[PDB]
Coordinates of C-alpha atoms and ligand atoms in Angstrom, one line a residue:
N8 CA 101.9 97.7 82.3
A9 CA 102.3 99.6 85.6
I10 CA 100.3 102.6 86.5
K11 CA 101.8 105.8 85.0
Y12 CA 102.9 108.3 87.7
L13 CA 101.3 111.7 87.1
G14 CA 100.1 110.2 83.7
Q15 CA 103.6 110.5 82.2
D16 CA 104.0 107.9 79.5
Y17 CA 107.6 106.7 79.1
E18 CA 107.2 105.2 75.6
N19 CA 105.2 108.1 74.2
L20 CA 107.5 110.7 75.7
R21 CA 110.6 108.9 74.4
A22 CA 109.1 108.5 71.0
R23 CA 108.0 112.1 70.9
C24 CA 111.4 113.4 71.9
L25 CA 113.0 111.2 69.2
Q26 CA 110.7 112.5 66.5
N27 CA 111.2 116.1 67.5
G28 CA 115.0 115.7 67.6
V29 CA 115.3 116.8 71.2
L30 CA 116.1 115.3 74.6
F31 CA 113.6 115.0 77.4
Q32 CA 113.3 117.6 80.2
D33 CA 110.9 116.7 83.0
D34 CA 108.3 119.3 83.8
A35 CA 107.4 117.2 86.9
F36 CA 110.9 117.2 88.3
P37 CA 113.0 119.9 86.4
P38 CA 116.7 120.5 86.5
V39 CA 116.5 123.4 89.0
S40 CA 117.2 124.0 92.7
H41 CA 113.7 123.1 93.8
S42 CA 114.4 119.5 92.8
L43 CA 117.6 119.6 94.8
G44 CA 116.0 120.9 98.0
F45 CA 114.5 123.6 100.1
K46 CA 116.8 124.1 103.1
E47 CA 120.2 122.3 103.4
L48 CA 120.0 121.8 99.7
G49 CA 118.0 124.9 98.9
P50 CA 119.0 127.6 96.4
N51 CA 120.4 129.8 99.2
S52 CA 122.7 127.0 100.6
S53 CA 126.5 126.7 100.3
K54 CA 126.0 122.9 99.9
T55 CA 124.5 123.6 96.4
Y56 CA 127.3 126.0 95.4
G57 CA 128.8 124.9 92.1
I58 CA 126.1 122.3 91.4
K59 CA 125.3 122.0 87.7
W60 CA 122.7 119.6 86.1
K61 CA 124.3 117.5 83.4
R62 CA 123.3 114.4 81.5
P63 CA 125.6 111.3 81.3
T64 CA 125.9 111.9 77.6
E65 CA 127.3 115.4 78.3
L66 CA 129.7 114.0 80.9
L67 CA 131.2 110.9 79.2
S68 CA 131.7 109.8 75.6
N69 CA 130.5 106.3 76.4
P70 CA 128.0 106.4 79.4
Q71 CA 126.3 103.1 80.3
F72 CA 123.1 102.3 82.1
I73 CA 124.3 99.0 83.4
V74 CA 127.9 97.7 83.5
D75 CA 128.8 94.2 84.6
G76 CA 125.3 93.8 86.0
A77 CA 123.3 95.9 88.5
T78 CA 125.0 94.9 91.8
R79 CA 125.5 96.4 95.2
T80 CA 128.9 97.8 94.4
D81 CA 127.0 100.2 92.1
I82 CA 125.5 101.9 95.2
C83 CA 127.9 104.5 96.6
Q84 CA 126.1 107.2 98.7
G85 CA 126.7 110.9 97.8
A86 CA 126.3 114.1 99.7
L87 CA 122.8 113.1 101.0
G88 CA 121.5 111.4 104.1
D89 CA 119.6 108.7 102.3
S90 CA 121.4 105.6 103.5
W91 CA 118.0 104.0 104.3
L92 CA 117.0 104.1 100.6
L93 CA 120.5 103.2 99.3
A94 CA 120.8 100.3 101.6
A95 CA 117.5 99.0 100.3
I96 CA 118.6 99.3 96.7
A97 CA 121.8 97.5 97.4
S98 CA 119.9 94.6 99.0
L99 CA 117.4 94.7 96.1
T100 CA 120.3 93.8 93.7
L101 CA 120.6 90.5 95.6
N102 CA 117.1 89.5 94.3
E103 CA 117.2 89.3 90.5
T104 CA 113.4 89.0 90.4
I105 CA 112.6 92.2 92.3
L106 CA 115.6 94.0 90.7
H107 CA 114.1 93.6 87.2
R108 CA 110.8 94.9 88.4
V109 CA 112.1 98.2 89.8
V110 CA 114.7 98.6 87.0
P111 CA 113.1 97.9 83.6
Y112 CA 115.6 96.2 81.3
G113 CA 116.3 97.5 77.8
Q114 CA 117.4 101.0 78.7
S115 CA 120.6 102.5 77.4
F116 CA 122.3 105.6 76.1
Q117 CA 122.6 104.2 72.6
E118 CA 119.8 103.1 70.2
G119 CA 116.6 104.8 71.1
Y120 CA 118.1 107.2 73.6
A121 CA 116.2 110.4 74.2
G122 CA 117.4 111.6 77.6
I123 CA 114.6 109.7 79.4
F124 CA 114.5 106.7 81.7
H125 CA 111.9 105.0 83.9
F126 CA 111.6 103.0 87.0
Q127 CA 108.8 101.3 88.9
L128 CA 108.0 101.8 92.5
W129 CA 105.3 100.6 94.9
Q130 CA 103.5 103.9 95.7
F131 CA 100.0 105.1 96.6
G132 CA 99.3 101.4 97.2
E133 CA 100.2 100.2 93.7
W134 CA 102.9 99.6 91.1
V135 CA 103.7 102.9 89.4
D136 CA 106.0 103.7 86.5
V137 CA 108.0 106.9 87.1
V138 CA 110.0 108.7 84.4
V139 CA 112.9 111.1 84.8
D140 CA 115.1 112.9 82.3
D141 CA 118.8 112.1 82.7
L142 CA 120.0 115.5 83.9
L143 CA 121.9 114.8 87.1
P144 CA 123.3 117.0 89.8
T145 CA 127.1 117.3 89.4
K146 CA 130.0 119.3 90.8
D147 CA 133.2 119.5 88.8
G148 CA 132.0 116.8 86.4
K149 CA 131.3 114.3 89.1
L150 CA 127.9 113.1 90.5
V151 CA 126.9 114.9 93.7
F152 CA 124.6 112.1 95.0
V153 CA 124.6 108.3 94.6
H154 CA 127.1 106.9 92.0
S155 CA 128.5 103.6 91.0
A156 CA 132.0 102.2 91.7
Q157 CA 132.0 102.1 87.9
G158 CA 132.4 105.7 86.9
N159 CA 130.5 105.2 83.7
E160 CA 127.5 103.5 85.1
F161 CA 124.3 105.4 85.7
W162 CA 121.3 103.1 86.5
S163 CA 121.6 103.7 90.3
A164 CA 121.9 107.5 90.0
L165 CA 118.9 107.5 87.8
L166 CA 116.9 105.3 90.1
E167 CA 117.7 107.5 93.1
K168 CA 116.5 110.5 91.1
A169 CA 113.2 108.8 90.4
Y170 CA 112.8 108.1 94.1
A171 CA 113.7 111.7 94.9
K172 CA 111.1 112.8 92.3
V173 CA 108.1 111.0 93.8
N174 CA 109.1 112.5 97.2
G175 CA 109.6 116.1 95.9
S176 CA 113.3 116.6 95.9
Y177 CA 116.6 115.1 97.0
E178 CA 116.5 116.8 100.4
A179 CA 113.1 115.2 101.0
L180 CA 115.1 111.9 101.2
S181 CA 117.3 113.2 104.0
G182 CA 116.9 110.8 106.8
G183 CA 114.4 108.0 106.8
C184 CA 113.3 104.4 107.6
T185 CA 114.9 101.6 105.6
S186 CA 111.6 99.7 105.8
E187 CA 109.8 102.5 103.8
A188 CA 112.2 101.9 101.0
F189 CA 111.8 98.1 101.2
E190 CA 108.0 98.5 100.9
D191 CA 108.4 101.0 98.0
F192 CA 110.4 98.4 96.2
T193 CA 108.4 95.3 97.0
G194 CA 104.9 96.0 98.4
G195 CA 105.9 93.3 100.9
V196 CA 105.6 92.9 104.6
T197 CA 108.2 94.6 106.7
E198 CA 109.2 93.6 110.3
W199 CA 111.9 95.0 112.6
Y200 CA 113.8 93.6 115.6
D201 CA 115.2 95.3 118.7
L202 CA 118.6 93.6 118.7
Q203 CA 119.0 94.4 122.4
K204 CA 116.0 92.1 122.9
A205 CA 117.0 89.7 120.1
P206 CA 115.0 86.4 119.8
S207 CA 117.1 83.2 120.5
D208 CA 116.5 82.1 116.9
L209 CA 117.1 85.4 115.3
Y210 CA 120.1 84.1 113.3
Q211 CA 117.9 81.3 112.0
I212 CA 115.3 83.9 111.0
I213 CA 118.1 85.8 109.2
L214 CA 119.2 82.6 107.4
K215 CA 115.8 81.7 105.9
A216 CA 115.1 85.4 105.1
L217 CA 118.3 85.7 103.0
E218 CA 117.6 82.3 101.4
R219 CA 114.2 83.4 100.2
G220 CA 115.7 86.6 98.9
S221 CA 114.1 88.9 101.4
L222 CA 115.6 92.4 102.0
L223 CA 117.5 93.0 105.2
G224 CA 119.0 96.1 106.7
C225 CA 120.4 97.1 110.1
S226 CA 121.3 100.3 111.9
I227 CA 122.6 101.8 115.2
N228 CA 120.5 104.2 117.2
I229 CA 122.6 106.2 119.7
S230 CA 121.7 108.3 122.7
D231 CA 122.7 111.6 121.2
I232 CA 119.5 112.9 119.5
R233 CA 120.5 116.4 118.3
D234 CA 123.2 115.6 115.7
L235 CA 122.4 112.6 113.4
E236 CA 124.9 110.9 111.0
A237 CA 128.3 110.1 112.6
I238 CA 130.9 107.4 113.0
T239 CA 132.5 106.0 116.2
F240 CA 135.8 104.6 117.5
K241 CA 134.8 101.2 116.2
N242 CA 134.5 102.6 112.7
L243 CA 130.7 102.1 112.6
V244 CA 128.2 104.9 111.7
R245 CA 125.1 105.7 113.7
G246 CA 121.7 106.6 112.3
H247 CA 123.1 104.9 109.2
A248 CA 121.5 102.1 107.3
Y249 CA 123.7 99.1 106.3
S250 CA 122.5 96.3 103.9
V251 CA 122.8 92.8 105.4
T252 CA 124.2 90.8 102.5
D253 CA 125.0 87.3 103.9
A254 CA 125.0 85.0 106.9
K255 CA 127.4 82.1 107.1
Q256 CA 128.8 79.7 109.8
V257 CA 132.5 79.0 110.1
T258 CA 134.7 76.7 112.2
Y259 CA 136.8 78.8 114.5
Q260 CA 139.4 77.1 116.7
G261 CA 137.3 74.0 116.2
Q262 CA 133.8 75.3 116.8
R263 CA 130.8 76.8 115.1
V264 CA 130.7 80.6 114.9
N265 CA 127.8 82.5 113.4
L266 CA 128.9 85.3 111.1
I267 CA 126.9 88.0 109.4
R268 CA 128.0 90.2 106.4
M269 CA 126.8 93.7 105.8
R270 CA 127.6 96.6 103.5
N271 CA 127.9 100.3 104.2
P272 CA 126.1 102.2 101.4
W273 CA 129.1 104.7 101.4
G274 CA 131.0 101.9 99.7
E275 CA 133.8 102.5 102.3
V276 CA 134.5 102.8 106.1
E277 CA 134.3 99.3 107.6
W278 CA 134.2 97.5 111.0
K279 CA 137.8 96.9 112.3
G280 CA 137.0 94.4 115.0
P281 CA 136.9 90.6 115.0
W282 CA 136.3 89.1 111.5
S283 CA 137.1 92.4 109.7
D284 CA 138.7 92.1 106.3
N285 CA 142.3 91.9 107.6
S286 CA 141.5 90.6 111.1
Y287 CA 143.5 87.8 112.9
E288 CA 140.6 85.4 113.2
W289 CA 140.7 84.5 109.5
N290 CA 144.1 82.8 110.2
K291 CA 142.5 80.3 112.5
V292 CA 140.0 79.1 109.9
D293 CA 140.5 76.5 107.2
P294 CA 141.8 78.1 104.0
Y295 CA 138.9 76.8 101.9
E296 CA 136.3 78.3 104.1
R297 CA 138.1 81.6 104.5
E298 CA 138.8 81.7 100.8
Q299 CA 135.1 81.5 100.1
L300 CA 134.1 84.1 102.7
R301 CA 136.8 86.7 103.4
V302 CA 137.5 89.4 100.9
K303 CA 140.3 92.0 101.4
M304 CA 139.0 95.2 99.9
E305 CA 137.9 98.6 101.0
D306 CA 134.4 98.2 99.6
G307 CA 132.3 99.0 102.7
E308 CA 131.3 95.4 103.0
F309 CA 132.5 93.2 105.9
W310 CA 131.8 90.4 108.3
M311 CA 131.0 90.4 112.0
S312 CA 130.3 87.5 114.4
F313 CA 126.6 87.4 115.1
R314 CA 127.6 88.0 118.8
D315 CA 129.2 91.3 118.0
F316 CA 126.4 92.3 115.6
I317 CA 123.6 92.1 118.1
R318 CA 125.7 94.0 120.6
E319 CA 126.9 96.8 118.3
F320 CA 123.7 97.3 116.2
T321 CA 120.4 98.2 117.7
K322 CA 117.9 97.6 114.9
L323 CA 117.3 94.9 112.2
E324 CA 114.7 95.3 109.5
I325 CA 113.5 92.6 107.1
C326 CA 111.1 92.8 104.2
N327 CA 108.9 89.7 104.0
Ligands
LIG401 CA1 127.5 97.5 87.8
LIG402 CA1 135.5 94.9 102.9

């Protein structure tokens, strides 16, 4: 029984909509421009041209809250600079325990559906339950913001809306610190590392962190200040949070090489250097080992040697 955000009671509201034969519309975060934004996503912006609020039940004949589990592939960033949040959610899915906390199970578009969903966040120094109606920003029938690789899955889009709600609007989520999201999802201790001054046992730190199910994210801070959000020649994006999803050692040409796996919340655009999906290095590794690690697929997830990682990336964040 978490603390009810703004006093909105999920069960009561759902029950009331059901009895009144209507679907929920949230007075605290209504389907209007003010929930979208105030400037770049404000009512007078071309970025919001053609945006229409629609429920999944208005979009598809068989919408689903969760399809084939709530995993990181269900996190594909939309037209919003909230990679910090999205990278946190992706990592969150790697910890069943915390995942079930944030995303209450038992929600669907079938039995008991009334156009209302809820999520729990660590806010105001406590666990809070936040509700939202399922009206989502769309353009041409497709979700404008976060969406799942599964076109009929909506749990991540609804979770992102709930986070947008407590912050005031989707635009309020434009640009941020991955650690803030980690905290808002765990209430745990966050710590960051300057990769240019990486500890000698940082890889070891990463290993145990991943083992315990901690949340890890990394990013690249470039010189250019007046710009934000942009890729490079090495196909990496700056000021963009990536979820660190694994850390494994392999035998290359007869020796131990420390590798690290991460995922771009865009769900696409990957590193093309050593150890990339179709890189040459995978040929000089025993089939078994490379069969269990390498995956050829444009999914935004890829491996890098730990050596290249600490050179290319500048910041690493870990939640407890
Ligand atoms: Ca899924
Ligand atoms: Ca990949």
